Amino acid sequence: NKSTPNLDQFLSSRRGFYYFDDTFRSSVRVLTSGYFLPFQSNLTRYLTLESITGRRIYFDNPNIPFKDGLYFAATEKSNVIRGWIFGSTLDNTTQSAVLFNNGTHIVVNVCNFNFCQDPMLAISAGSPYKSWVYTTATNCTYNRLHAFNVHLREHVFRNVDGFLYVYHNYESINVTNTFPGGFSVLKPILKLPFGLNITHFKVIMTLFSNTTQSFEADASAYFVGHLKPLTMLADFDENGTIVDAVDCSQNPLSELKCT
Amino acid sequence: TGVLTESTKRFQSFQQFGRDISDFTDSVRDPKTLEILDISPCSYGGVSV
Amino acid sequence: YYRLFRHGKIKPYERDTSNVPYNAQGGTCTDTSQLNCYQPLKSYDFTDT
Numbered sequence: 352n353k354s355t356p357n358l359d360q361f362l363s364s365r366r367g368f369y370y371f372d373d374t375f376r377s378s379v380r381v382l383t384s385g386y387f388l389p390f391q392s393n394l395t396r397y398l399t400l401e402s403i404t405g406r407r408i409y410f411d412n413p414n415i416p417f418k419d420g421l422y423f424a425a426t427e428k429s430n431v432i433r434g435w436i437f438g439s440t441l442d443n444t445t446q447s448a449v450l451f452n453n454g455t456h457i458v459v460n461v462c463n464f465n466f467c468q469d470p471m472l473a474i475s476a477g478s479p480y481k482s483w484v485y486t487t488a489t490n491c492t493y494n495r496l497h498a499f500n501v502h503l504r505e506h507v508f509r510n511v512d513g514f515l516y517v518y519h520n521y522e523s524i525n526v527t528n529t530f531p532g533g534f535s536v537l538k539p540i541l542k543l544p545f546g547l548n549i550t551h552f553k554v555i556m557t558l559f560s561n562t563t564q565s566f567e568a569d570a571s572a573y574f575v576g577h578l579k580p581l582t583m584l585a586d587f588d589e590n591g592t593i594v595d596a597v598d599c600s601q602n603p604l605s606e607l608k609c610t
Numbered sequence: 611t612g613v614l615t616e617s618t619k620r621f622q623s624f625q626q627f628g629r630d631i632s633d634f635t636d637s638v639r640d641p642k643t644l645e646i647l648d649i650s651p652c653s654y655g656g657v658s659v
Numbered sequence: 660y661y662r663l664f665r666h667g668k669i670k671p672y673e674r675d676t677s678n679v680p681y682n683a684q685g686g687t688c689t690d691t692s693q694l695n696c697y698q699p700l701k702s703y704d705f706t707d708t
């Protein structure tokens with residue numbers, strides 16, 4: 352009943368920079384090498400849009416390979432994108448993780464989940480009704496709950512030495528179809544000792560309705576980008592805060608500024 | 611080893627010590643008081659005979 | 660129990676809690692009691708003598 356996704360690609364501008372170390376600095380330029388999102392690279396966009404003619408719903412949620420990190424952006428309203436699923440096969444043969452944050456509170460679970468076909472949360476913008484994410488979970492190792500109740504939301508996912516790293520940022524924007532442009536820095540929020548082999552991830556969606564037992568559609572979009580091994584340069588102010596950065600493999604002025 | 615004195619610096623929320631470009635420690639949060647201090651070489655300057 | 664047969668080598672601070680038949684020749688296998696099937700876990704023997 353769904354429609355073939357439009358795998359359109361926009362330009363990533365100068366986004367995707369995060370904090371790579373926990374040392375404290377003041378007015379220092381530091382050159383590093385790591386796994387970062389390259390400047391001005393194709394960012395693949397998936398959309399959730401209202402049906403017009405019939406069962407034309409664009410309910411995008413494929414399996415996107417993790418590779419060596421992930422950058423995930425969301426432009427939406429009324430909190431349609433809520434949670435993430437990490438795993439290897441995403442079956443009940445291998446342990447998997449769900450990192451839901453909305454709903455009652457942030458629920459972080461590592462179990463042997465048997466997921467359904469559409470990880471869709473059947474709720475609305477408030478006073479939620481049901482929850483459709485699981486079918487069975489036999490052997491659970493980690494269960495944590497954190498007390499907590501058009502925009503731009505940014506996340507970065509990494510997996511190093513058995514630790515899952517999650518970085519987050521938020522901004523308020525106004526746009527219709529294109530992708531924004533600007534500079535953002537991502538602060539470290541989450542670091543979890545899970546120690547599992549992550550090769551695939553999937554998103555969780557919600558279907559807003561009008562006080563009815565039938566649910567359908569919303570207006571939103573989420574963007575995916577993959578990380579690559581690069582070298583970059585960063586700048587720090589008096590009180591530690593990244594003000595700008597450069598990509599030392601983009602254009603000759605960049606290697607000049609990097610040498 | 612050195613003299614400890616009162617401090618007027620600002621620390622970014624949780625932070626235990628601060629250094630400089632030469633990696634010389636010059637500040638500690640001195641727990642049980644939480645009042646930032648300053649460290650200084652015992653002798654610094656110059657003495658001629 | 661400790662795992663005896665695996666295709667690749669694990670990475671630091673990473674665990675695997677799987678139990679699937681390991682085909683010597685190739686990728687997948689879903690039937691034991693064969694001439695080429697090998698369970699991936701073997702049991703220690705801590706007896707008295």
Ligand SMILES: *[C@@H]1O[C@H](CO)[C@@H](O[C@@H]2O[C@H](CO)[C@@H](O[C@@H]3O[C@H](CO)[C@@H](O[C@@H]4O[C@H](CO)[C@@H](O)[C@H](O)[C@@H]4O)[C@H](O)[C@@H]3O)[C@H](O)[C@H]2NC(C)=O)[C@H](O)[C@H]1NC(C)=O
Nearest residue numbers: 439440548549550666667668669670682683684685686687
């Ligand atoms: C994370 O988890 C994924 C699985 O979800 C792991 O991916 C597996 O990776 C292996 C390669 O290391 C891949 O191929 C298997 O191994 C051999 C090819 O490399 C093949 O079997 C072998 O064939 C040889 C030649 O005949 C033979 O000599 C040898 O004895 C063996 O029979 C075959 O292609 C295997 O499938 C798996 O397909 C792949 N599984 C997947 C993708 O589901 C990944 O390695 C894990 N990462 C970490 C860090 O552990």
Ligand SMILES: *[C@@H]1O[C@H](CO)[C@@H](O[C@@H]2O[C@H](CO)[C@@H](O)[C@H](O)[C@H]2NC(C)=O)[C@H](O)[C@H]1NC(C)=O
Nearest residue numbers: 376377378587588589590591592593594620622
């Ligand atoms: C570092 O922090 C200080 C303190 O917040 C900033 O100085 C303040 O700047 C604002 C205006 O942006 C003034 O309203 C405050 O009165 C200032 N306070 C002090 C103590 O100076 C400073 O701009 C920040 N600088 C960096 C490097 O981010």
Ligand SMILES: *[C@@H]1O[C@H](CO)[C@@H](O[C@@H]2O[C@H](CO)[C@@H](O)[C@H](O)[C@H]2NC(C)=O)[C@H](O)[C@H]1NC(C)=O
Nearest residue numbers: 623624625626638639640641642643644645646
């Ligand atoms: C560590 O313990 C010391 C006491 O041994 C605490 O210092 C006292 O703090 C109270 C206020 O909470 C004051 O009324 C006392 O006058 C202090 N006495 C001394 C000896 O300093 C200190 O606050 C404790 N630190 C923490 C973080 O609780």
Ligand SMILES: *[C@@H]1O[C@H](CO)[C@@H](O)[C@H](O)[C@H]1NC(C)=O
Nearest residue numbers: 360361362390391392393394
């Ligand atoms: C994005 O993809 C198009 C089509 O392959 C390509 O022409 C364009 O150069 C790509 N953008 C980048 C990252 O250069």
Ligand SMILES: *[C@@H]1O[C@H](CO)[C@@H](O)[C@H](O)[C@H]1NC(C)=O
Nearest residue numbers: 352353408409410411469471
């Ligand atoms: C497609 O139809 C099935 C019927 O069970 C339904 O569960 C699913 O939600 C529909 N597609 C979407 C993405 O809504």
Ligand SMILES: *[C@@H]1O[C@H](CO)[C@@H](O)[C@H](O)[C@H]1NC(C)=O
Nearest residue numbers: 442443444465466486487489
């Ligand atoms: C495991 O998952 C598969 C696919 O959903 C299912 O066919 C099987 O019955 C499940 N078995 C268990 C252990 O629940």
Ligand SMILES: *[C@@H]1O[C@H](CO)[C@@H](O)[C@H](O)[C@H]1NC(C)=O
Nearest residue numbers: 443462463488489490491676
């Ligand atoms: C869970 O672990 C127990 C051993 O503690 C094992 O007997 C059981 O089969 C496991 N279940 C699954 C499907 O992980």
Ligand SMILES: *[C@@H]1O[C@H](CO)[C@@H](O)[C@H](O)[C@H]1NC(C)=O
Nearest residue numbers: 428501502524525526527528
């Ligand atoms: C941009 O702002 C206008 C006016 O507030 C609003 O109607 C529109 O929904 C915003 N962008 C989108 C397409 O969400």
Ligand SMILES: *[C@@H]1O[C@H](CO)[C@@H](O)[C@H](O)[C@H]1NC(C)=O
Nearest residue numbers: 559560561562563564565567
């Ligand atoms: C109310 O529900 C109807 C479907 O019964 C829908 O077409 C309409 O857009 C909804 N309006 C509101 C107030 O959400």
